[PDB]
Structure formats: structure tokens, C-alpha cells
Amino acid sequence: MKVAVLPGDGIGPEVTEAALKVLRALDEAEGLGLAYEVFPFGGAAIDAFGEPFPEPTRKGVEEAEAVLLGSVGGPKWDGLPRKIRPETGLLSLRKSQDLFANLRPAKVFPGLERLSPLKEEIARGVDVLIVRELTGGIYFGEPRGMSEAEAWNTERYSKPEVERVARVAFEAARKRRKHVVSVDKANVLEVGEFWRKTVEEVGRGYPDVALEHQYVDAMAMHLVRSPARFDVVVTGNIFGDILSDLASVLPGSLGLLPSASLGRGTPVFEPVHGSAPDIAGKGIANPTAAILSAAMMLEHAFGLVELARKVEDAVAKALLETPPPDLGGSAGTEAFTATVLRHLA
Amino acid sequence: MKVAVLPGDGIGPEVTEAALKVLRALDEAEGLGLAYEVFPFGGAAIDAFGEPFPEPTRKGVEEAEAVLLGSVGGPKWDGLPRKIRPETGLLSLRKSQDLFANLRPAKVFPGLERLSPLKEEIARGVDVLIVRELTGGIYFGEPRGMSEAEAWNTERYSKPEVERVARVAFEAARKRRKHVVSVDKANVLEVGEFWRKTVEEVGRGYPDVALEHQYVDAMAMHLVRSPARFDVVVTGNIFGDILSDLASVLPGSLGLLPSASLGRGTPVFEPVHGSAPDIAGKGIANPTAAILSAAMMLEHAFGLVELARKVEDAVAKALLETPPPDLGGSAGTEAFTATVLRHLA
Ligand SMILES: CS/C=C(\O)C(=O)O
Ligand SMILES: CS/C=C(\O)C(=O)O
Ligand SMILES: [Mg+2]
């Protein structure tokens, strides 16, 4: 279990640190290879190297079997050359490993229905994972331009691009509730039809996982009227861009949300939240997102599903017992983490 | 006020009839040109003409200043040649008038917050109109195809296409709460940038209406966390296809939802709901959608905004006093309509 740890900026190191306490506790009690090293990333890296993705860090990432990322960015770097801003650090990092699968789970833990924008009965049981294709589609298609009278972008997927992201979604569902929904616009766009026929075929290699197809519009509705019926959801880039964002508001607090990015290279696992300069150093950031990213790490990077569910279950109990300030309670970062640890023990 | 009335099938004529009672009442009390004629459309037209969009109806549409549509379709026509199915009637009708602007309002009437999938506090006050470009974008772009190893669609807007739909949204906002949000993916797609710069420029011709720009993902979130802050929302075809569907689940009952389609030709105003064969002839269909389409007609086709708000206000009072079965109450089509009429008087 060789992890490169990239705490970054703002609340990044605070929440990262909380995740490590959890990973460490887990190491001592269960004995894992846990070996890890802290590299400077983003702002922290600029401060000390003139650039956000240094070669020592680049070296660490490569060699590591997984990256636990914090968050990067902040005022003290916002007026800087695009090529060198902390955000372009993220972009290089991701590109550097050809991560084509973004996993974002939206979960409403038992008792936390009160937080959802949805009504109690609709929010109960929600636990959906959105799997987004990262490297293809309209965001990257050629030809693409703007003339004065018109503009054009091209949505483009090839068969191997659809296949790999599909495969990730199926692996994921097998570790979960064995049900996949694939989202396209197949009744209108050929790229849609193409997606659907291709995923249908991949699904044939996972006879344990059921597969079902919906239209992106239909799906935007279901995510609001009845999100609790879904398990894994997989889709193309732009739609994933919309849908995970849609799914994400569901638990009703930013501090709850983890992320994994998978592909060829080193998997990266990060909280969705940014570096939160307005609260950095206050010891109040909710570390759930980070801890849940470690959980996701154990799961997707190390096939350690049971340990992942153990963290999740501890976190779910902590969120009830000593909820953080963003959940309406009082537990600062260290104190909440201590509650997670009481439940791992 | 020359209206071609196209009741169609299933609950179509039932709910259409309710809207006419309202329009008629409104005619006698306020004196409008109300003149109208019932043409057979969809199934009804097939039954008696071998085809769903007959030339008498085609004639009526053209010559009429507005079409009040019911709904078409049903089992007794589903196994028929594409070219002749009731749905292709809809398609020809719409095409025949080059309707490029689809307006769908999602409204949570006071006291009906209980119906929303959203929580009471978020649902209160929601009254958003989604304006969708109908005739351009990726749904229609060339080149477009599927090979065996890949598939491609092209998203394409020209400056006059963006302009006309923008204009419709601005006209609409002036009649409402004078605030427009334009939704694109401008930080990634040139078509996005192009949309945004173009709408920005149109906005300059409506100095009474404020204009604001969001990303389709951001907007999917806002529609769920805080839909009550919006007035008119305008966007491209595919995004509109997603977003209005998203907005539409918000009032929390299909029977509440109206639609207008505007362009060069005759404006058509219809309920979003289909022909509902499973309840046709039972005298229970909620006629709110239809009545609200007449309301939309008065408004968008005849600039009669005050009369439109009068219908809306009556409908809102009826929905509280004698709610229909789909709202959890008992009022069948005639009885609910009678409650609308008591409040128009
Ligand atoms: C393009 S991938 C973005 C994320 O993974 C995030 O915002 O956490
Ligand atoms: C393509 S436009 C669709 C509608 O207007 C509707 O479903 O009511
Ligand atoms: Mg399968």
C-alpha cells in the first residue's frame, strides 16, 4: 500500500491529515502495507519550487500505487500564468495518468435525510455512484471552432473509450449492489446509439451485474424523484459532468463528498471540495469527504471493499454522534476524526 | 382571437374541453374575438382520414392565430408506419410552423409545496420558465454518423438561431419578473462561448430585463437547491431538453404542466402530458395543464398578460379548494373546471 499523499492548500492538509489518521489506525489494527510519503502539490509546491506539479511529486505519483489528494488553489496564486496556476497542477496530474473514469458517490447516510434538498422519504436510502468518462466526447472533439456567423463542436466517442469507462462502472457495481444504469441520448444522437450498443456488449462480460439504459433527460428527473433506486450510473463526459453535479447536491452538504479518478496510471482520490481559504487553519473543516476518499482508495485502488465499508460505517456513525458544523453541529476536524476512530476500533 | 383547436386523443378532448369552457367564460365576460374551430388531429384524424395531420387541419392551423392542442397517440395506432403515427403528426405540425422556442413553466402554487419532491422551504415560490431552442444544435448538426470503431455528432448553432430564441426568452421575462438566465457550457465549448456572447448582445435590447449566465451543470444543481430564485431560463436544444425535464418534476404532478411552442408560424399551446389511454373517458384527468396552456396562449400568442394571470390565479385557488385526484383529492375534470370558473367570475 504505497500512497503518494498530496495535501496541497487551504483545508487540504487538515482533512488529508484526518484521512491518514484513519488509514494509520487501519494499518495498525489490520496490518496493511501502508507506506506513504507527503509531496508538495499546488500552491504549497509553487511556494517552494516555482511550479505546482514538481518532478519529485511527479516521481512520487508514478511510483505510488495510489494518490490521496487534498485540494489546491487560493487567492495568493489566482493572478498567475495559466501554465503555472495550482488548477493546471490538477490538470497535469490527471492527464499525466490518463484517468478516464471519474467516480462520484452521492450518499444520504441514515439519519441525515434532514440535510437533503429532497424530502425525507425520497432522500432515504440514496446511495448512487456516478461514473463519468473523462477523456473523450464533445469537450475534446475535433473539428471545433467559432466563426463570426456560427460555431461548432463535435461530440466523438470511439469504441475503446466507451469500453474502458463501461468496464470501470461494472467492476464498481460488482463491489456494490450489482446494478448499472447507462445514460445516453440514443433515441436522437448516433453517438448515443453507439454508446448504448457498446455498453450493452460490455455488460455481457458481467453476468452478475444487471444493466439498464436511460436517456439523460429521463435520468435528470429520476435523480430528483427517486434517486434511491439507483446503484451505479455510467455515462459520457458532458452528461457525467451534469449528472454527477446533479447527484451531488443530494446528500445536501459539500463536506460529505468524495471522488476517485481511475485509468491507466496511478488512481487519484480526492474530496470534491476545494481548499476553502475562508476556513483554512480554523480546525473546522468537515473531514468526511477526505476520509471517504481514503475509503474509496481502499476500495477501487486496493480491492479492499470490506475495509472501505468499515470506514464508511464509522463515518456514518460519527456524522450522527458528533456532526460537524456544516451538518449543523459542533465537531471540529480533530474531534470528528476522533469519533470516526472510536467507531473503527 | 382565431384559434384552431386540436383535441386529439385519449384525455385530449376532455381537458381541451375544460380549457375552452375557461376561454369561453373569458370571452363572454371580457369580450375577446374568441372564434375557434375543432379540427381532428392525431388518432382521431387517422380514424377518419388515413393520416394524422390532414389538410383541413393543416389549413386551420395556418389560418388560425394560435393552436390549442390536446394530446395524441395510443395503443390503437402504435403498430403503424412511422410516417403515419400520431407522434409524427406532432412532428409535422411543429415543423410546419418552424417553432424554434419551447416554453415550459414549472410552478409550485402556494399551498402545493407538499407535492414537490423538494422540501417545503425550497419548493415555496418556485416559478421558473424554461425556454428551449427547438430547431438547432447537436440534435440536428451535420456531419453525423456511426462507423464500426466510432461515432460522431456535431453541435452547431448559428448567430440568427441563438438570436431568435434569446429574443423569445426576453419578451417572456418582460411579461414576468424581468430576470433571465442563459445556460451554456462556455468555459469548455466554443459553441458555448458563442451562445454566451450572442445572448449578451441581445440582452442589450432589453434594458428592463437583467441577464445572467450559468453553466448547465451549475444550473442542474441550482434547479434542485434553489429553484425559487429563477424567473426565465434560456438555453440550447439538448440542454433545454434536460433542464426543462429537470424543472418539470419540481411542482410534483404531471397534470399541472403547460407548454407553448413559438416561432414563425402559428404558436401551439399544449399540455406536456400525453393522451393517457388508461384514464381516457373516466372524467378524472386533471385539466390544469390544458387550462394553463390556454393561459399561456392568452399570454404569448395574444399579449393578454393580465387575463393569463387571472386564469393562473383561479387555477391556483381551485387546486387548493377542490384538488384533483392526482393532487391527492377528488375533483374530476368537470368539477375542478367548475371551481376554476367560480374563481374567474
Ligand atoms: C475533471 S475531474 C473533477 C473532480 O474530480 C473534482 O472536482 O473533484
Ligand atoms: C419537442 S417539443 C415537446 C413538447 O412540447 C412536449 O412534450 O409537450
Ligand atoms: Mg451485465
Ligand SMILES: [Mg+2]
Ligand atoms: Mg438585458
